[PDB]
């Protein structure tokens, strides 16, 4: 934002910004997310805020036998880490704000009863993410 | 010619018959006229399409009226020995409006009894569209004739400056069969009668002195003949325009004047030749329209009837001649008779009894 | 405006309307049944006529 | 013939309008609700009373659709005679209560956040 007359550092910021741009594009992918979720490991990353993975690849979140959603659904009860659980709640919130029949899929999976508990699960970061996910959940409702 | 075709729900048919006959049942103590009326009818088993028919039939009656009004405008246009008060209500089927309505029946020729009412409306639609096609074609013919006749009248209009000189130029003063002489048909004001006659002597050489003589007298000016040589015309006209003079070179040729006179003669003959069969065919259309219209109105009445009460054909048809400045009591007594029976509780909004306007 | 009896009268109004419509569809189906009865008679008899004529 | 939602204010006259369409033609379905929630249009608590004229034919059904649309009249409900409709409605109503308590806790979060922000 603050321009310098140092053309050298100008080109430096240029190539760094573009290179880290394609790097974050490479940290923005469906399959790496599937790998991370299958590893029982979740941490706030560009993947968890990767809007292209969220809106364009939501139909991909309907992976075979809904195993991705099943991993999330079983994490809704076996995940005893508040932060990983928060990430899962946010991801579910996205999957509901994008695809309403996926919403009804989750309703069939019974995740709403588990999520209700997160709306009142000690940690205040857990209240917030449960409330936000359900706020997404209440479209057409 | 205000009238109203009244329909009764028909609680007991004889009761409504008595309602539509007697002087007491006639409102205002029989200051108006209540004549009974009857027609054949038909059965309909679906009311959805019936109310559809009701709406399109209201629209249909509408343009139907528009069409015969246009007709009456054409009657006023032609004025073929017919005035707005003479033969205004042509006696269709030999009878006027009132006798026709009281005498009216379903047109068997136009349709049988059992023809479904929707199909009858379709037949009426085809007939009226056909009539309208004929009306616009006849209108085109009449417009062509009238415009041509107006052009013929305009041929004989205007002063002698711009009017056809067909009745004016004569050969005796108009010099033909001479490559030398040629007659300028000068236009000279009456106030300048002797003046320009005198000054035409010396406007140019190769001239005949003072040959300027009156041909035909108009109101403010008059055409006149001056004989002089052909190349004299150029200098003559130049010095004429210099002195504020008028010269018109109307060339003589007898055959086109004869042709125009025969043209206006034959167009007058075509005018009467069209006007005769035209008024006959228009009498035919007036009768046909008027008949189909009272049928349309009767059908629409029957439609409202079947809409506004129970299933049988309990219904009586009537004609009304309202009394002058007493329609208020007519309507009030009709309310007293019918509105309390309309429903246990109690215009476009409230309308316990049915009656629809007519004025030819 | 309408007691129970009068609303029932309107109900019977529509009953009679569907009486007539039911009769219309029933007699239409019957007339079409006889039409197809005749038509299929003609078609089958014509086809067997062709077969037998070929044989002979 | 499903009871709609009208605010009892133009019922005597909307009945007149329904009569001018067809005077006393079909069954009238009645209902009434007291002390209703704040309206979606203005937020008022005007009491509701409704009387509905309904037609089974297609054209007349569409005509009454036009009439009810020409006025502030809601005809959303589409019930069904079997009890399954009412059972699903009751389950939905449990979800409605869930939405109510969700609204409560969201407001709780809102107010605590605003107090935190305003403190500084």
UniProtKB/Swiss-Prot annotation, chain A:
Subunit of the V1 complex of vacuolar(H+)-ATPase (V-ATPase), a multisubunit enzyme composed of a peripheral complex (V1) that hydrolyzes ATP and a membrane integral complex (V0) that translocates protons. V-ATPase is responsible for acidifying and maintaining the pH of intracellular compartments and in some cell types, is targeted to the plasma membrane, where it is responsible for acidifying the extracellular environment. Subunit H is essential for V-ATPase activity, but not for the assembly of the complex. This is V-type proton ATPase subunit H. The gene is Atp6v1h. It comes from Mus musculus. The chain holds residues 323 to 463 of 483 of the full protein. V-ATPase is a heteromultimeric enzyme made up of two complexes: the ATP-hydrolytic V1 complex and the proton translocation V0 complex. The V1 complex consists of three catalytic AB heterodimers that form a heterohexamer, three peripheral stalks each consisting of EG heterodimers, one central rotor including subunits D and F, and the regulatory subunits C and H. The proton translocation complex V0 consists of the proton transport subunit a, a ring of proteolipid subunits c9c'', rotary subunit d, subunits e and f, and the accessory subunits ATP6AP1/Ac45 and ATP6AP2/PRR. Interacts with AP2M1. One of its GO terms (molecular function) is proton-transporting ATPase activity, rotational mechanism. Its main location: membrane.
Swiss-Prot record, chain B:
The modification N-acetylthreonine is found at residue 1. Keywords: Acetylation, Cytoplasmic vesicle, Hydrogen ion transport, Ion transport, Membrane, Synapse, Transport. It is found in: Cytoplasmic vesicle, Secretory vesicle, Synaptic vesicle membrane; Cytoplasmic vesicle, Clathrin-coated vesicle membrane. Ubiquitous. Abundant in brain, liver, kidney and testis. It comes from Mus musculus. Gene3D superfamilies: 3.30.70.100, subunit c (vma5p) of the yeast v-atpase, domain 2, Vacuolar atp synthase subunit c, domain 1. It is a peripheral membrane protein. GO terms for cellular component: apical part of cell; ATPase complex; clathrin-coated vesicle membrane; extrinsic component of synaptic vesicle membrane; plasma membrane; proton-transporting V-type ATPase complex; proton-transporting V-type ATPase, V1 domain; vacuolar proton-transporting V-type ATPase, V1 domain. The lineage of its organism: Eukaryota, Metazoa, Chordata, Craniata, Vertebrata. This is V-type proton ATPase subunit C 1. One of its GO terms (biological process) is synaptic vesicle lumen acidification. GO terms for molecular function: proton-transporting ATPase activity, rotational mechanism.
Swiss-Prot record, chain C:
The modification Phosphotyrosine is found at residue 55. The modification N-acetylalanine is found at residue 1. It is found in: Apical cell membrane; Cytoplasmic vesicle, Secretory vesicle, Synaptic vesicle membrane; Cytoplasmic vesicle, Clathrin-coated vesicle membrane. Expressed within the midpiece of sperm tail (at protein level). Kidney; localizes to early distal nephron, encompassing thick ascending limbs and distal convoluted tubules (at protein level). V-ATPase is a heteromultimeric enzyme made up of two complexes: the ATP-hydrolytic V1 complex and the proton translocation V0 complex. The V1 complex consists of three catalytic AB heterodimers that form a heterohexamer, three peripheral stalks each consisting of EG heterodimers, one central rotor including subunits D and F, and the regulatory subunits C and H. The proton translocation complex V0 consists of the proton transport subunit a, a ring of proteolipid subunits c9c'', rotary subunit d, subunits e and f, and the accessory subunits ATP6AP1/Ac45 and ATP6AP2/PRR. Belongs to the V-ATPase E subunit family. This is V-type proton ATPase subunit E 1. It comes from Mus musculus (Mouse).
UniProtKB/Swiss-Prot annotation, chain D:
The modification Phosphothreonine is found at residue 81. It is found in: Cytoplasmic vesicle, Clathrin-coated vesicle membrane; Cytoplasmic vesicle, Secretory vesicle, Synaptic vesicle membrane; Melanosome. Disruption phenotype: Embryonic lethal. Knockout embryos die at 5 to 6 dpc, before gastrulation. Belongs to the V-ATPase 116 kDa subunit family. It comes from Mus musculus. Predominantly expressed in neurons in the cortex and in the dentate gyrus, CA1 and CA3 regions of the hippocampus (at protein level). Expressed at lower levels in astrocytes, oligodendrocytes and microglia (at protein level). In the cerebellum, present in Purkinje and granule cells (at protein level). The gene is Atp6v0a1. This is V-type proton ATPase 116 kDa subunit a 1. It comes from the Eukaryota. The lineage of its organism: Eukaryota, Metazoa, Chordata, Craniata, Vertebrata. The chain holds residues 177 to 296 of 839 of the full protein.
């Amino acid at each position: 934002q603050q321009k310098y007359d140092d053309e050298d550092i100008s080109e430096d910021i240029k190539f760094l910004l573009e290179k880290l741009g394609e790097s974050v594009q490479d940290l923005s992918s469906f399959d790496e997310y599937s790998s991370e979720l299958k590893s029982g490991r979740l941490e706030w990353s560009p993947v968890h805020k990767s809007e292209k993975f969220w809106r364009e690849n939501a139909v991909r979140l309907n992976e075979k036998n809904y195993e991705l959603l099943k991993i999330l659904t079983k994490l809704l009860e076996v995940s005893d880490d508040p932060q990983v659980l928060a990430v899962a709640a946010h991801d579910v919130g996205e999957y509901v704000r994008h695809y309403p029949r996926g919403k009804r899929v989750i309703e069939q999976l019974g995740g709403k009863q588990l999520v209700m508990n997160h709306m009142h699960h000690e940690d205040q970061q857990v209240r917030y993410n449960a409330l936000l996910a359900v706020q997404k959940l209440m479209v057409h409702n | 010619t205000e009238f109203w075709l009244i329909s009764a729900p028909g609680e007991k048919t004889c009761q409504q018959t008595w309602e539509k006959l007697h002087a007491a049942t006639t409102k205002n103590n029989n200051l108006a006229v209540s004549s009974k009326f009857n027609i054949p009818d038909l059965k309909v088993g679906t009311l959805d399409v019936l109310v559809g028919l009701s709406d399109e039939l209201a629209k249909l009656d509408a343009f139907v009226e528009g069409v015969v009004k246009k007709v009456a405008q054409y009657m006023a246009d032609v004025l073929e020995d017919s005035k707005d008060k003479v033969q205004e209500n042509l006696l269709a089927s030999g009878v006027d409006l009132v006798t026709y309505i009281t005498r009216f029946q379903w047109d068997m020729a136009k349709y049988p009894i059992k023809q479904s009412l929707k199909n009858i409306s379709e037949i009426i639609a085809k007939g009226v569209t056909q009539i309208d096609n004929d009306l616009k074609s006849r209108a085109s013919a009449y417009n062509n004739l009238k415009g041509n006749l107006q052009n013929l009248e305009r041929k004989n209009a205007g002063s002698l400056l711009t009017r056809s000189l067909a009745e004016i130029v004569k050969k005796d003063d108009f010099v033909l069969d001479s490559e030398y002489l040629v007659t300028l048909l000068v236009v000279v004001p009456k106030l300048n009668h002797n003046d320009w006659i005198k000054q035409y002597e010396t406007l140019a050489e190769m001239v005949v002195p003072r040959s300027s003589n009156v041909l035909s007298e108009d109101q403010d000016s008059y055409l006149c003949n001056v004989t002089l040589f052909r190349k004299a015309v150029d200098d003559f006209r130049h010095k004429a325009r210099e002195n504020k003079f008028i010269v018109r070179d109307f060339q003589y040729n007898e055959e086109e004047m004869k042709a125009d006179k025969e043209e206006m003669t034959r167009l007058s003959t075509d005018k009467k030749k069209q006007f005769g069969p035209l008024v006959r065919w228009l009498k035919v259309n007036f009768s046909e329209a008027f008949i189909a219209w009272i049928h349309i109105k009767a059908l629409r009445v029957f439609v409202e009837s079947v809409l506004r009460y129970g299933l049988p054909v309990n219904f009586q048809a009537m004609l009304l001649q309202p009394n002058k400045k007493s329609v208020k009591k007519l309507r009030e007594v009709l309310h007293e008779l019918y509105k309390h029976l309309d429903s246990s509780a109690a215009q476009q909004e409230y309308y316990p009894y049915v009656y629809y306007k007519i004025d030819c | 405006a309408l007691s129970d009896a009068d609303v029932q009268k309107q109900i019977k109004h529509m009953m009679a309307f569907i009486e007539q419509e039911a009769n219309e569809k029933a007699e239409e189906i019957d007339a079409k049944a006889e039409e197809e009865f005749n038509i299929e008679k003609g078609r089958l008899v014509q086809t067997q006529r062709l077969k037998i004529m070929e044989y002979y | 013939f499903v009871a709609g939602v009208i605010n009892r204010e133009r019922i005597p006259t909307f009945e007149r309008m329904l009569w001018r369409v067809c005077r006393g033609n079909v069954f009238l379905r009645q209902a009434e609700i007291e002390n209703p929630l704040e309206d979606p249009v203005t937020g008022d608590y005007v009491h509701k009373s409704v009387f509905i004229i309904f037609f089974q034919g297609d054209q007349l059904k569409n005509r009454v659709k036009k009439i009810c649309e020409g006025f502030r009249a809601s005809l959303y409900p589409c019930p069904e005679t079997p009890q399954e409709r009412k059972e699903m409605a009751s389950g939905v109503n449990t979800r409605i209560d869930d939405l109510q308590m969700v609204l409560n806790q969201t407001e709780d979060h809102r107010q605590r956040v605003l107090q935190a922000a305003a403190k500084n």
